[PDB]
Design a protein around this ligand. Structure first.
Ligand SMILES: C=C/C=C\[C@H](C)[C@H](OC(=O)NCCCNC(=O)c1cccc(N=[N+]=[N-])c1)[C@@H](C)[C@H](O)[C@@H](C)C/C(C)=C\[C@H](C)[C@@H](O)[C@@H](C)/C=C\[C@@H](O)C[C@@H]1OC(=O)[C@H](C)[C@@H](O)[C@H]1C
Ligand SMILES: Nc1nc2c(ncn2[C@@H]2O[C@H](COP(=O)(O)OP(=O)(O)OP(=O)(O)O)[C@@H](O)[C@H]2O)c(=O)[nH]1
Ligand SMILES: Nc1ncnc2c1ncn2[C@@H]1O[C@H](COP(=O)(O)OP(=O)(O)CP(=O)(O)O)[C@@H](O)[C@H]1O
Ligand SMILES: Nc1nc2c(ncn2[C@@H]2O[C@H](COP(=O)(O)OP(=O)(O)O)[C@@H](O)[C@H]2O)c(=O)[nH]1
Ligand SMILES: [Ca+2]
Ligand SMILES: [Ca+2]
Ligand SMILES: [Ca+2]
Ligand SMILES: [Mg+2]
Ligand SMILES: [Mg+2]
Ligand SMILES: [Mg+2]
Lengths: 428, 54, 434, 345
C-alpha cells in the first residue's frame, strides 16, 4: 500500500495530467465514472498507488488539480474523464499568473498555496504508507513553473523524508508562448535542482520534431504532443502501477538512477513511433523496439546522447514477448555503443518487462536515461536567458512583483554550475 | 588411503579418508553507533529546515 | 538434542526460507497443517528433527524460525501460503517501508527502530529450547535489509548469545537478476561488519544458480522460484546432518571445526551434483563425485585448480556405500589438481544419508537415486571477493551513490574502513593459497 | 562488432595483432579498464583472471593460460619435470638440472652428490648457473655466485658437445613458436629461427660468454663478428635444412623437428589438466616460445619455455595473422595453414 499523491499545476500541467489519468484509467480498467470493468487481476493489484477506494468499488484518482485561473480546469471537468476526479481536489484562483514566474511564486501563487497544501495534507493523511509526490507542470509559464516550484518547496518542508518527482516540460523557441519562458525556466530549474529527487525533462521541441519528422504529422497540435507525453508517462510509471521487481517504488528508483544528488534530470523516450497507413499494422519486434528506443530522434529532451554519456539507464518493455530476446537486444546496444555508457558504474543499464501493454498495442517500450548530454538542454536555456538579461529586457514584469536583479543573477549562476557539473562527469 | 572413524546407523554412515598427512562490541557501544548516526540525520534535516525557513 | 533457530532477513532470505521449510516438511513427512503421523511422541520429544521443529500439544510441528522484512508484501506470501498453518504471527515481523537497497537505511535508520522487536521474537523461540546451538541466518548481500539489518542483528546476537554459533547462507549479487546498482557497496559494507560475528558462511552466487538452471534444467529465463528450489536443495544437503541421525556435522560447532581452521577464512565453496531436468524423458558414485570438481556445478564460479584446499566434506544422499566413494576419490586424485595447504591433511570427511534427495512435486528437478554436495574451503573463492571489490572501487573513486548512505547518517569513513578490511581479507587468502 | 582491450603496451606481438583486428573493421578497441570486452590482450604480471567470464552475454577470451607460468619459469620448469610422472626425473630430453636457493633464504646436497660422481669418473663436469649466468666446471664457484644473489637459481649440466655450424665453428639455439587455442589444439608455427653465435666456440674459456651464450641481445653487443654469416645472427629453416643436407646428409625434419614436436607435445599435454579452459566460464589461448639446443649427435634438448615471446622481425606479419585466424577468429568469426597441428588424444 505505497501510495503516490499526484499534483498537476497550470495549463500545461493540467492538460497533460488529464490525458495521463485518461490513459492509465483505461489500463487499470476504470471507466469515466470510477467503476472497474476490467478482466485481469493485474489491473487492481497495485491500483492503490494512484487510486483511492470509495464506497461501492469506486476508484478515485489521488490527484490534485491546481491553477491560478479557472479556464483549463473547467475544460478538464468538462472533458471525458473529468467526472472521475475528486471535486474538492480542484483548487483554483481567478487572477491568473500572466506567464510570470514571480506571480506564481511570490504574489498570486502565495495567496493560493495554503489551500492546495490543505488538500495535499488531507490526501496524505489517508495514505497507509506514502511514497511521495508526482507533479506535472511546465517551466515556461507562470503557474506551473512559479507556483509549482513554490508547492514543491512547501511540500518538502512538511514532508522532508518523502520522494519528490516531477514531469517538467522545458520551453523551446520553436514551440513558444512568450519571450519570457527562458526567465521562468531558469528560475524554476534551480528550484528543481534542490528540491526534487527525479525530474523527467520533456522538451516541447523534441515532441514537435518527433510528430513532424518521424510521425509525418504536418501540423502537430498540443493535443498530439500531450498524448505522446501521456504514453511516455504511462510507460515510465509501469514499474509503480503493476507487479514488478525493478524500480518498484520511488525511492529504489532514485537510488538506482541518481548517483549524484543534483544530477537527477532524466531523458525519457517511447517506442513505437509509427506513421499511420500501410506499415502500421506490422507486427513489432523486440529488435525494432530497442533500436527505436535508443535512437536520438526518438528522445524527448532534444539532446544528442552521442554528445554525452549515460550514467544510468532504465528500459521497460510492455507486452507478451521473449524476456530472453529482451536481454539479448539490450546487451547488444551497450556492447556495441560502449562509448556512450560510463565505465565507473558497473551494470548501469537495468531492464524490466511488464505483461500488460498499452491499449491497442501488442508491445511497447519506454526508456529512462540519466545522461550528461542533458547539459545541452540547460545550455540552450542559459544562452536564451543571457541574451535577454544582458540588456535587462522584460525584467520590469518581474521587478514589479518584488523581485530584484540579484535573484536573476543567482539563478543564472546556479544553472551554469549545473552545466559544469555534467561536463565534469562526461569526461571522467 | 586410510578410512578412519567409520560410524554406521540405520539412516546412513560417515567416515574420513586421509590420503596424505600434513607437513566483540558491547550493547552500549552499538547504541552509541546507532544514536550517533541518528544524530547526523537530525542535524542534516535541521540544516534543510533552516534553509527552507530562510 | 540441541535446537537450531533459523532467521530469514529481507526478500531473498524470506523466499529462500519459505522454499527450505517446504522441502524440510517433504523430507520429514510433515503435512502443511503441521501434523507428522510418523511422530509417535505426541507433544514433544528430542529426536533429530526436533532441532528444527518444536511440537505443540495438539501434534503440530512448528519451525524454529523467524522471518523479518522491512516491507510486508513478501512475508504476506508466508501468511497465506501452502504452509501458512506451520507458523504463528509472533514468528513473522514486518515493517512499512523498506531499506531501498540502501545498507545505511537498513542498518541505522530502520534497523534501530525494529531491532528490539526482532530480538524479542527470537528470545521467545530461544526460551523454548533446552540447549540452543545457535542460529542459521539467510539474507542477500545486495538488498538494503539483507545487508544492513542483518549486520546489525549479527552484532546484537553476539551480545545476547555470546556462546552460540552463527552460520550464514548469503546470496552474492549477480547483474543477470540484480535489482540495484549499489549492491557492491552493500555487499562490502555488510561483509565488513558481519565478518567477526559469523562462524561459517555459505555464499551462493545468483550467477551460478542462474546458469545451472539454464544449462541443466533447460529453463530459458529462470525465476526466483526456479532459483530458490535449487538453493533449498543445497541448503537441505548442508543442514541434513543437523536434522537426521548421523555422526558428521551433527552440531553447528562441527561446521567450524571441520571447515574453518582460519576464522576470517570462513566461506566454504559448495558444489552440488546431479542437477537433472524433470522434463527430461542415472549417474554413478564416481560420476557425481567427479562432477564436484567442475566449476560449472559450483555455487560460486571460480577455479579451485589455482588455489589451495584447507578442508573438504562430501555429503552424499541416496544409494551410496563407502567402498564406491573411496574408489571415486582415488581415481579423481590421479586426474585432478587438488593441492592442500602444507599445514592440513590431504583428505576428505564423508557423510552418507541413505535417503535420496526429496523433490518438490511438479518442480523442475528430476528425482535421482544419489546426489552429493561437496563443502570445500578453498582459497579460490577469493575470486568472488576480487570481483566485488573491483566494482566497489570503480564507483567509490567518483563517490557515486555515496550521498544516499551519508544521508542516512552513515559516515564516508565506513566505506574506506570496510574496503580496507576486504583488502586485508584478500591478502589473507593470497598468503594462504599462493 | 567485436570489442577488445590492450593491457600490455610493451608487447611486440600483440601490437601487431591489435592493428590487424582494427584493419578488419569489425573489431573496436576499448579503454584498458572497460570490462565489456570480448578479447583481453592482458598484462604479463598479475593478470586479473578472477574477473573474466562474468559479463552477461559476452563470450570472453584472453591471450594467456592461467597457470602456464609453471612451464615458463626456470625453477618451476625443473620442479615440474622432476615431479610429473609424464616427464619424470629420468626425462631424456631435458638437461640434468637442480634448484638451488641462496643461503640467505633446495637441492644443494643432491647436486653436489652428482657432481662428485662425474669428477670421480673422469667425465666432463661443466655446469651453468642461471635464474630469472655463470658457466664453470668448479662447483664452489657456481654456489658462491648464487649466494651473492637473492633469488632462486638453477644449476644445469652444460652441453659441452654442441652441434657447431660451419664455417665459424659456432654455437646456436632453435626457437619454435607454438600456439595453443581455446580447445587446447597445439599449433607449431612452421617457421623457426636459429639464434647463432658469431664467435667460434671455445671450450677452453667459459669466462668469455659470447661464443657460449647465443642470445640475440648478447651477440648484438659483445660479438665483434655480429652479422658476418647471417643477417642478425638469425638463420631460418630453409637455410638450416639445406645445410644439414649438404653437411650431414640428413634433413631438418628427420634429425631435429621430430624431437622438437615430441618435446612440445609432452610439456603441454602434461599441464593440460591444470590449465585447460575447456569447461571454464572464460577461454584462454597463448603463444609460447620453446628454446632448444642441439648436440653433435643431433639430439635435441629443451632449454626453456618462454610465455611472452617475441618473434623474428621478418616473421611478425605471418605469425600474427595466424594468431588472429586460429586463436581469435575461431571464437569470434568474421563476416594452406602456416601451423602444424600436433595431434594428441
Ligand atoms: C500518429 C500515429 C498514430 C498511431 C501510430 C500508427 C501508432 O499506433 C499504432 O501502432 N497502433 C497499432 C496499429 C493499429 N491497431 C489497432 O487499431 C488496434 C485495434 C484493436 C486492438 C489492437 N491491439 N490491441 N489491443 C490494435 C502509435 C503507437 C504512434 O506510434 C504513437 C506515436 C501515437 C502517440 C502516442 C501519440 C500520437 C502523436 C497522437 O496523435 C495520438 C492521438 C494518436 C494515436 C494514439 O491514440 C495511439 C495510442 O496512444 C497511446 O497512448 C498508446 C500508446 C496506444 O493506445 C496508442 C495506440
Ligand atoms: N536467489 C534469490 N535471490 C534473490 C531473491 N530475492 C532477491 N534476491 C537477490 O537479492 C538482491 C536484492 O535484495 P533483496 O533481498 O530483494 O532486498 P531486501 O533484503 O529485501 O532489502 P530492501 O528491499 O532494500 O529493504 C538482488 O541481488 C537479488 O538478485 C530470491 O528469492 N532468490
Ligand atoms: N645447459 C646448457 N648447455 C649449453 N648451453 C646452454 C645451456 N643453457 C643455456 N645455454 C645457452 O645459454 C643461453 C641461455 O639462455 P636461457 O635458455 O638459459 O634463458 P635466458 O632467460 O637466459 C634467454 P632465452 O629466452 O633466449 O633462452 C642459451 O640460449 C644457450 O645459448
Ligand atoms: N506539451 C505541452 N506544452 C504546453 C501545453 N500548454 C502549454 N505548454 C507549454 O508550457 C509553457 C506555457 O506554460 P503554461 O502551462 O501555459 O502556463 P501556466 O498555466 O502559467 O503554467 C510554454 O512553454 C508552452 O509551450 C500543452 O498542453 N502541452
Ligand atoms: Ca488577489
Ligand atoms: Ca515427538
Ligand atoms: Ca562470536
Ligand atoms: Mg497558461
Ligand atoms: Mg525488500
Ligand atoms: Mg627467459
Amino acid at each position: 500500500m505505497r501510495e503516490i499523491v499526484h499534483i498537476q499545476a497550470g495549463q500545461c500541467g493540467n492538460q497533460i495530467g488529464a490525458k495521463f489519468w485518461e490513459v492509465i484509467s483505461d489500463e487499470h480498467g476504470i471507466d469515466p465514472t470510477g467503476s472497474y470493468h476490467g478482466d485481469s487481476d493485474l489491473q487492481l493489484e497495485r491500483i492503490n498507488v494512484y487510486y483511492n477506494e470509495a464506497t461501492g468499488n469506486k476508484y478515485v484518482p489521488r490527484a490534485i488539480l491546481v491553477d491560478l485561473e479557472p479556464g483549463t480546469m473547467d475544460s478538464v471537468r468538462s472533458g471525458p474523464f473529468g467526472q472521475i476526479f475528486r471535486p474538492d481536489n480542484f483548487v483554483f484562483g481567478q487572477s491568473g499568473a500572466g506567464n510570470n514566474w514571480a506571480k506564481g511564486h511570490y504574489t498570486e501563487g502565495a495567496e493560493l498555496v495554503d489551500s492546495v497544501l490543505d488538500v495535499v495534507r488531507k490526501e496524505s493523511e489517508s495514505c497507509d504508507c506514502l511514497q511521495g509526490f508526482q507533479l506535472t507542470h511546465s517551466l515556461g509559464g507562470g503557474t506551473g513553473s512559479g507556483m509549482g516550484t513554490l508547492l514543491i518547496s512547501k511540500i518538502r518542508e512538511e514532508y522532508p523524508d518523502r520522494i519528490m518527482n516531477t514531469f517538467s516540460v522545458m520551453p523551446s523557441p520553436k514551440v513558444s508562448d512568450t519571450v519570457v519562458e527562458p526567465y521562468n525556466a531558469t528560475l524554476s530549474v534551480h528550484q528543481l535542482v534542490e528540491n526534487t529527487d527525479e525530474t523527467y525533462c520533456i522538451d516541447n521541441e523534441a515532441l514537435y520534431d518527433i510528430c513532424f519528422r518521424t510521425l509525418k504529422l504536418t501540423t502537430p497540435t498540443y493535443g498530439d504532443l500531450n498524448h505522446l507525453v501521456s504514453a511516455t508517462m504511462s510507460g515510465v510509471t509501469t514499474c509503480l502501477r503493476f507487479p514488478g521487481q525493478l524500480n518498484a517504488d520511488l525511492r529504489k528508483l532514485a537510488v538506482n538512477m541518481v548517483p549524484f544528488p543534483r544530477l537527477h534530470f532524466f531523458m525519457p523516450g517511447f517506442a513505437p513511433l509509427t506513421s499511420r497507413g500501410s506499415q502500421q499494422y506490422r507486427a513489432l519486434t523486440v529488435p525494432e523496439l530497442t533500436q527505436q528506443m535508443f535512437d536520438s530522434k526518438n528522445m524527448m529532451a532534444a539532446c544528442d546522447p552521442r554528445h554525452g554519456r549515460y550514467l544510468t539507464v532504465a528500459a521497460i518493455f510492455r507486452g507478451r514477448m521473449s524476456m530472453k530476446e529482451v536481454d539479448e537486444q539490450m546487451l547488444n546496444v551497450q556492447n556495441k555503443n560502449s562509448s556512450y555508457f560510463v565505465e565507473w558504474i558497473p551494470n548501469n543499464v537495468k531492464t524490466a518487462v511488464c505483461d500488460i501493454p498499452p491499449r491497442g498495442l501488442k508491445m511497447s517500450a519506454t526508456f529512462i536515461g540519466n545522461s550528461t548530454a542533458i547539459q545541452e538542454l540547460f545550455k540552450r536555456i542559459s544562452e536564451q536567458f543571457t541574451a535577454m538579461f544582458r540588456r535587462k529586457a522584460f525584467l520590469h514584469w518581474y521587478t514589479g512583483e518584488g523581485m530584484d536583479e540579484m535573484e536573476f543573477t543567482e539563478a543564472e549562476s546556479n544553472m551554469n554550475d549545473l552545466v559544469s557539473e555534467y561536463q565534469q562527469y562526461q569526461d571522467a | 588411503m586410510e578410512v578412519i572413524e567409520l560410524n554406521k546407523c540405520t539412516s546412513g554412515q560417515s567416515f574420513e579418508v586421509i590420503l596424505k598427512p600434513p607437513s566483540d562490541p558491547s550493547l552500549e557501544e552499538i547504541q552509541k553507533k546507532l544514536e550517533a548516526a541518528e544524530e547526523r540525520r537530525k542535524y542534516q534535516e535541521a540544516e534543510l529546515l533552516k534553509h527552507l525557513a530562510e | 538434542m540441541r535446537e537450531c533457530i533459523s532467521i530469514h532477513v529481507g526478500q531473498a532470505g524470506v523466499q529462500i526460507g519459505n522454499a527450505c521449510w517446504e522441502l524440510y516438511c517433504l523430507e520429514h513427512g510433515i503435512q502443511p497443517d503441521g501434523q507428522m503421523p510418523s511422530d509417535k511422541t505426541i507433544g514433544g520429544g528430542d529426536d533429530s528433527f526436533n532441532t528444527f521443529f518444536s511440537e505443540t500439544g495438539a501434534g503440530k510441528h512448528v519451525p524454529r524460525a523467524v522471518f523479518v522484512d522491512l516491507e510486508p508484501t513478501v512475508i504476506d506470501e508466508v501468511r497465506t501460503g501452502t504452509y501458512r498453518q506451520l507458523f504463528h504471527p509472533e514468528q513473522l515481523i514486518t515493517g512499512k517501508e523498506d531499506a531501498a537497497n540502501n545498507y545505511a537505511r537498513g542498518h541505522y535508520t530502520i534497523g534501530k527502530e525494529i531491532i528490539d522487536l526482532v530480538l524479542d521474537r527470537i528470545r521467545k523461540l530461544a526460551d523454548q529450547c533446552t540447549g540452543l546451538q545457535g542460529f542459521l541466518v539467510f539474507h542477500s548481500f545486495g538488498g538494503g535489509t539483507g545487508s544492513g539489518f542483518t549486520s546489525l542483528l549479527m552484532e546484537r546476537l553476539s551480545v545476547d548469545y555470546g556462546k552460540k554459533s552463527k552460520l550464514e547462507f548469503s546470496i552474492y549479487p549477480a547483474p543477470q537478476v540484480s535489482t540495484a546498482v549499489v549492491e557492491p557497496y552493500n555487499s562490502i559494507l555488510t561483509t565488513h561488519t558481519t565478518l567477526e560475528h559469523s562462524d561459517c558462511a555459505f555464499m551462493v552466487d545468483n550467477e551460478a544458480i542462474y546458469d545451472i538452471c539454464r544449462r541443466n534444467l533447460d529453463i530459458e529465463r529462470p525465476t526466483y522460484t526456479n532459483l530458490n528450489r535449487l538453493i533449498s536443495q543445497i541448503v537441505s544437503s548442508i543442514t541434513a546432518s543437523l536434522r537426521f541421525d548421523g555422526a558428521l556435522n551433527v552440531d553447528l560447532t562441527e561446521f567450524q571445526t571441520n571447515l574453518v581452521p582460519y576464522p576470517r577464512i570462513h566461506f566454504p565453496l559448495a558444489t552440488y551434483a546431479p542437477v537433472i531436468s524433470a522434463e527430461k524423458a542415472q549417474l554413478s558414485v564416481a560420476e557425481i563425485t567427479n562432477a564436484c570438481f567442475e566449476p560449472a556445478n559450483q555455487m560460486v564460479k571460480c577455479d579451485p585448480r589455482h588455489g589451495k584446499y584447507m578442508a573438504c566434506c562430501l555429503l552424499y544422499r541416496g544409494d551410496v556405500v563407502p567402498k564406491d566413494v573411496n574408489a571415486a576419490i582415488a581415481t579423481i586424485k590421479t586426474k585432478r589438481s587438488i593441492q592442500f595447504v602444507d599445514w592440513c591433511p590431504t583428505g576428505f570427511k564423508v557423510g552418507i544419508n541413505y535417503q535420496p534427495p526429496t523433490v518438490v512435486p511438479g518442480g523442475d528437478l528430476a528425482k535421482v537415486q544419489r546426489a552429493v554436495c561437496m563443502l570445500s574451503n578453498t582459497t579460490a573463492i577469493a575470486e568472488a571477493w576480487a570481483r566485488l571489490d573491483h566494482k566497489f572501487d570503480l564507483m567509490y573513486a567518483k563517490r557515486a551513490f555515496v550521498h544516499w548512505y551519508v544521508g542516512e547518517g552513515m559516515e564516508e569513513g565506513e566505506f574506506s574502513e570496510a574496503r580496507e578490511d576486504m583488502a586485508a581479507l584478500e591478502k589473507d587468502y593470497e598468503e594462504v593459497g599462493v | 562488432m567485436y570489442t577488445f582491450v590492450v593491457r600490455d603496451e610493451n608487447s611486440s606481438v600483440y601490437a601487431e595483432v591489435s592493428r590487424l583486428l582494427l584493419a578488419t573493421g569489425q573489431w573496436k578497441r576499448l579503454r584498458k579498464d572497460n570490462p565489456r570486452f570480448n578479447l583481453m590482450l592482458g598484462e604479463r604480471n598479475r593478470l586479473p583472471f578472477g574477473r573474466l567470464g562474468h559479463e552477461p552475454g559476452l563470450v570472453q577470451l584472453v591471450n594467456y593460460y592461467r597457470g602456464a607460468d609453471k612451464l615458463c619459469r626456470k625453477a618451476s620448469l625443473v620442479k615440474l619435470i622432476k615431479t610429473s610422472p609424464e616427464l619424470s626425473e629420468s626425462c631424456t630430453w631435458f638437461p640434468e638440472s637442480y634448484v638451488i636457493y641462496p643461503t640467505n633464504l633446495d637441492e644443494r646436497e643432491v647436486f653436489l652428490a652428482a657432481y662428485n660422481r662425474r669428477r670421480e669418473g673422469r667425465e666432463g663436469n661443466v655446469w651453468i648457473a642461471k635464474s630469472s649466468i655463470l658457466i664453470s666446471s668448479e662447483a664452489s664457484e657456481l654456489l658462491d655466485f648464487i649466494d651473492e644473489q637473492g633469488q632462486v637459481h638453477v644449476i644445469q649440466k652444460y652441453l659441452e658437445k654442441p652441434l657447431l655450424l660451419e664455417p665459424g665453428h659456432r654455437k646456436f639455439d632453435i626457437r619454435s613458436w607454438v600456439l595453443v587455442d581455446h580447445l587446447y589444439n597445439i599449433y607449431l608455427y612452421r617457421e623457426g629461427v636459429l639464434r647463432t653465435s658469431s664467435e667460434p666456440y671455445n671450450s677452453a674459456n667459459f669466462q668469455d660468454k659470447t661464443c657460449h651464450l647465443t642470445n640475440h641481445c648478447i651477440q648484438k653487443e659483445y660479438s665483434k663478428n655480429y652479422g658476418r654469416y647471417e643477417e642478425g645472427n638469425e638463420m631460418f629453416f630453409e637455410e638450416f635444412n639445406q645445410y644439414l643436407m649438404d653437411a650431414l646428409n640428413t634433413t631438418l625434419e628427420n634429425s631435429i623437428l621430430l624431437q622438437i614436436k615430441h618435446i612440445i607435445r609432452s610439456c603441454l599435454m602434461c599441464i593440460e589438466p591444470a590449465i585447460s579452459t575447456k569447461h571454464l566460464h572464460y577461454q584462454s589461448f597463448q603463444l609460447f616460445g620453446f628454446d632448444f639446443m642441439v648436440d653433435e649427435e643431433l639430439k635435441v634438448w629443451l632449454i626453456e619455455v618462454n610465455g611472452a615471446p617475441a618473434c623474428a622481425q621478418k616473421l611478425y606479419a605471418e605469425l600474427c595473422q595466424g594468431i588472429v585466424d586460429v586463436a581469435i577468429s575461431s571464437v569470434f568469426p568474421l563476416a594452406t595453414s602456416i601451423f602444424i597441428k600436433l595431434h594428441h588424444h
